[PDB]
Nucleic acid binder design. Structure first.
Length: 119
DNA sequence: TAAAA
């Protein structure tokens, strides 16, 4: 997920070439516990989506014009500061992100019994 | 075409 380049050989190529990462990943799920890592999940930012609270339906209200406008807005914001530092969350946003990632992360059970036994 | 798949 956190790889900036992909150094690999083409399907039938002769030598290994270098491709900068030109894609963004978005994942979809209905499980409430998808983060297997127990020592922090800073890569993945879970957004909980609620039906019947969607003001606009993504089936009939997202049209190429609307997504083009969204990407033009993103282009403006990125061109305000064209560096990777501008892509990080705000301090309070990152603070909430820690709690959200922990809440959606798998919990180890052995820790509880170890604590009880040591107590 | 063989490879590489």
């Amino acid at each position: 997920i956190s790889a900036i380049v992909d150094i690999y050989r083409a399907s039938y190529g002769k030598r290994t070439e270098r491709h900068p990462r030109q894609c963004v990943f978005v994942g979809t799920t209905n499980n409430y516990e998808f983060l297997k890592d127990q020592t922090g999940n800073r890569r993945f930012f879970p957004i909980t989506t609620d039906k019947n609270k969607a003001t606009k339906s993504p089936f009939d209200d997202l049209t190429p014009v609307v997504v083009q406008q969204m990407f033009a807005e993103a282009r403006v914001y990125f061109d305000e500061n064209p560096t990777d530092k501008a892509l990080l969350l705000d301090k309070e946003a990152s603070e909430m992100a820690l709690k959200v990632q922990e809440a959606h992360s798998e919990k180890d059970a052995l820790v509880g019994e170890i604590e009880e036994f040591l107590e």
